[PDB]
Amino acid sequence: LPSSNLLAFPIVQDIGDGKKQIAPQYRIQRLDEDSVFITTYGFIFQVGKHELLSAAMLCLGSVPNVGDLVELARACLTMVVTCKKSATDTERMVFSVVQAPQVLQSCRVVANKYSSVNAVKHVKAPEKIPGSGTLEYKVNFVSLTVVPRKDVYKIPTAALKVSGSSLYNLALNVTIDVEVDPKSPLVKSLSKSDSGYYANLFLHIGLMSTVDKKGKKVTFDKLERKIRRLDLSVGLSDVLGPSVLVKARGARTRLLAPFFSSSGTACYPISNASPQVAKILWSQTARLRSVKVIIQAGTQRAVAVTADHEVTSTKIEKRHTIAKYNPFK
Amino acid sequence: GLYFDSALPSSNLLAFPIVLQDIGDGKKQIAPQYRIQRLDSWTDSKEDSVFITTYGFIFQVGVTVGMISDNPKHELLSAAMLCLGSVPNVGDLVELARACLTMVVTCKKSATDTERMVFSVVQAPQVLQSCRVVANKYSSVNAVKHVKAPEKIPGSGTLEYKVNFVSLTVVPRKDVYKIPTAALKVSGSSLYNLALNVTIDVEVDPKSPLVKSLSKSDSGYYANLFLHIGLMSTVDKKGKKVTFDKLERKIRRLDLSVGLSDVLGPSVLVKARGARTRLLAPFFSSSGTACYPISNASPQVAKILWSQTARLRSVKVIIQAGTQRAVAVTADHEVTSTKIEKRHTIAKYNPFKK
Numbered sequence: 169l170p171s172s173n174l175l176a177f178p179i180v181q182d183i184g185d186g187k188k189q190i191a192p193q194y195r196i197q198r199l200d201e202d203s204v205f206i207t208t209y210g211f212i213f214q215v216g217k218h219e220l221l222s223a224a225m226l227c228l229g230s231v232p233n234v235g236d237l238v239e240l241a242r243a244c245l246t247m248v249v250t251c252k253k254s255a256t257d258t259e260r261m262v263f264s265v266v267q268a269p270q271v272l273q274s275c276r277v278v279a280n281k282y283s284s285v286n287a288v289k290h291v292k293a294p295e296k297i298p299g300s301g302t303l304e305y306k307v308n309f310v311s312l313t314v315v316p317r318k319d320v321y322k323i324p325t326a327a328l329k330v331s332g333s334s335l336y337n338l339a340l341n342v343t344i345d346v347e348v349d350p351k352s353p354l355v356k357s358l359s360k361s362d363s364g365y366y367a368n369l370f371l372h373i374g375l376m377s378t379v380d381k382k383g384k385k386v387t388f389d390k391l392e393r394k395i396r397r398l399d400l401s402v403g404l405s406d407v408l409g410p411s412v413l414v415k416a417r418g419a420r421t422r423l424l425a426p427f428f429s430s431s432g433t434a435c436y437p438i439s440n441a442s443p444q445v446a447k448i449l450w451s452q453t454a455r456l457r458s459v460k461v462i463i464q465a466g467t468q469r470a471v472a473v474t475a476d477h478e479v480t481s482t483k484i485e486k487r488h489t490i491a492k493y494n495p496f497k
Numbered sequence: 498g499l500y501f502d503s504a505l506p507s508s509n510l511l512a513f514p515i516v517l518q519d520i521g522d523g524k525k526q527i528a529p530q531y532r533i534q535r536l537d538s539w540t541d542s543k544e545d546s547v548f549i550t551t552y553g554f555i556f557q558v559g560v561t562v563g564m565i566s567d568n569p570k571h572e573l574l575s576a577a578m579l580c581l582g583s584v585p586n587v588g589d590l591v592e593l594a595r596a597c598l599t600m601v602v603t604c605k606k607s608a609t610d611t612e613r614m615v616f617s618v619v620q621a622p623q624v625l626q627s628c629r630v631v632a633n634k635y636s637s638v639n640a641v642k643h644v645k646a647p648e649k650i651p652g653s654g655t656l657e658y659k660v661n662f663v664s665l666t667v668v669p670r671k672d673v674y675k676i677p678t679a680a681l682k683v684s685g686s687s688l689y690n691l692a693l694n695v696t697i698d699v700e701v702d703p704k705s706p707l708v709k710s711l712s713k714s715d716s717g718y719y720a721n722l723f724l725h726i727g728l729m730s731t732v733d734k735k736g737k738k739v740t741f742d743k744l745e746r747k748i749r750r751l752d753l754s755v756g757l758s759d760v761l762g763p764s765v766l767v768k769a770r771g772a773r774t775r776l777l778a779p780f781f782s783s784s785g786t787a788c789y790p791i792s793n794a795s796p797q798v799a800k801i802l803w804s805q806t807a808r809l810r811s812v813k814v815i816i817q818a819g820t821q822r823a824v825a826v827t828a829d830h831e832v833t834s835t836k837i838e839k840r841h842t843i844a845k846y847n848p849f850k851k
Contacts, residue, residue, distance in 0.1 A: 178709045254817060254824050255692055255725035257681035259795050264825045282825035287723075288796050293710040295720040295798045299694030299815065300831060328610045339608055341652030353706050356514045357646040360561055367648040372608035442612050443641050443796075445648050462652065464607060468637035471607045472617040476653060 175451035193493035194241035199315035203230040209309040223292040227408040229275035241310040243269040249305040259287035289439040321429035335466030338374030345457040403488035410449035456486040500524040511804035530846035531594035531663040542669035546583040552662040580761035582629035612640035674782035688819030691727035696810040756841025763802035807843040
């Protein structure tokens with residue numbers, strides 16, 4: 169009965185259970201060099217009478233952390249936005265900002281007056297969106313996150329693809345508990361817990377050497393120490409989109425260096441990792457259920473024929489969560 | 498040994514887990530099925546290849562039963578698809594279909610850039626050794642593309658992929674030309690984006706949960722796909738600058754024709770009968786053809802098309818501005834319909850003979 173459950177639309181001018189219409193809502197995560205990252209969520213409608221078409225997410229960029237955050241979230245609802253389909257190598261949603269408040273002028277989207285973004289990642293059901301006709305995007309949810317810019321360093325794509333015979337792929341087996349109404353049609357795609365329901369996400373976060381300087385097998389017993397030394401913490405956030413933040417408290421080997429910032433931090437947008445999980449996290453409050461570090465072979469060909477190793481000597485700290493929305497006032 | 502609703506096509510079960518939970522009674526077990534699409538017609542080149550796409554299910558071995566999947570540690574997780582590549586077009590194609598059911602395949606999650614599904618080919622018959630996947634012995638593919646619900650797939654455990662549906666497409670290799678990504682990414686202020694507004698009718702039962710993500714209409718349900726297909730000049734030689742009249746004539750002269758296929762996955766086939774300008778030439782093969790895998794264009798539509806029969810409803814050629822920034826502040830032009838190739842559809846499956 170949280171109103172954000174309607175961000176699952178069409179998988180389900182307003183209505184829901186049970187005040188049977190919904191108000192605008194905001195949430196604010198504090199992860200505190202600080203900026204405030206702004207994500208909005210809402211609905212694509214065909215203007216008629218209005219036919220609700222799909223939920224959608226439009227992230228605006230970031231602004232300095234000054235002023236009353238509640239008042240900033242308020243201003244985000246005063247935008248007027250149109251949208252239309254386009255394509256490049258894949259389908260896009262193009263959002264045109266018709267009007268917006270002054271504080272926002274500073275974020276890339278508003279200054280630019282447009283955002284052309286990957287449709288599958290920002291629209292729940294882009295197949296329900298007509299390729300012509302008069303479409304509008306109405307914001308109902310504002311998600312702000314306060315965090316140092318340096319702390320949401322994204323790993324270059326090329327680094328995440330590096331593979332090699334003499335390397336081990338480091339990954340996280342992440343399970344995420346998700347609050348879902350048992351009769352929701354979303355249950356169908358989740359795993360069933362004894363407590364409720366959860367999503368699986370397998371995330372690549374590092375590389376390690378199969379050998380010690382110039383010689384022998386790394387004892388495969390003691391990759392484990394190297395990993396404990398890394399000292400990982402993992403959390404969830406909305407930083408322009410649901411994302412897994414990972415921190416290494418400990419020093420990094422040379423192979424692991426490009427996988428973290430100079431302050432031991434890495435942000436992994438889920439919509440690149442798993443577009444379907446990301447979209448579930450739009451509508452449901454969610455929390456890390458467990459995080460296991462896994463060592464796999466360092467090429468995909470080898471992964472196919474060789475047993476994964478689960479690292480058991482660690483206990484990953486699980487920290488921040490994707491927080492509940494609240495009405496204004 | 499999966500059960501399905503005996504009133505519906507067994508391929509509808511490839512939507513799993515997005516299916517109606519109550520499969521009526523009397524449920525009946527799914528049988529293996531295949532289909533063959535002939536594309537011999539569509540060009541002059543000889544039909545030299547058979548492209549093979551399999552579909553089936555991921556199971557976890559060794560908690561959660563239903564009407565569909567009733568077994569122990571044989572738990573049904575998700576539908577999935579595994580493209581194999583191509584073999585030469587020789588001999589009995591039905592027997593080639595059968596051989597695709599005799600493979601043993603395990604699978605596991607992995608990741609690099611994004612989540613992947615890694616399929617290992619443990620055993621495969623001699624007739625398939627030619628195809629890329631079987632000769633490599635594995636395939637690591639993007640998970641959201643090849644698995645209906647990657648989020649229901651565990652990061653460790655014993656998983657198996659069982660093939661139940663085989664889809665063979667007979668076609669000259671020359672013709673099924675995928676436009677390279679860079680070509681698709683070229684943009685410019687002195688350019689127009691040529692695109693297709695594609696609508697696709699899909700046969701679906703109304704109680705199915707799949708319906709929720711489709712557009713509704715008097716005839717039945719459809720999906721919307723917006724596909725980038727070419728580039729044109731905003732300007733002519735010497736003096737600028739091109740009239741709507743003249744764009745419209747260039748497009749009619751191109752004389753496009755569009756259809757559906759499974760070519761290592763649901764795909765839109767495009768044929769141009771007119772010659773191509775300097776700018777448009779990289780977007781078609783030497784015989785005027787292009788193959789667009791829908792799973793790149795619109796991954797969610799591709800996946801609907803695993804499980805439902807479909808055919809084109811309408812294809813309108815659109816021109817938008819040549820940069821995204823300008824698309825945002827300029828109206829599109831809907832220019833004309835393309836021809837629709839009636840022979841080219843996402844076609845029904847059939848059980849094998851006796």
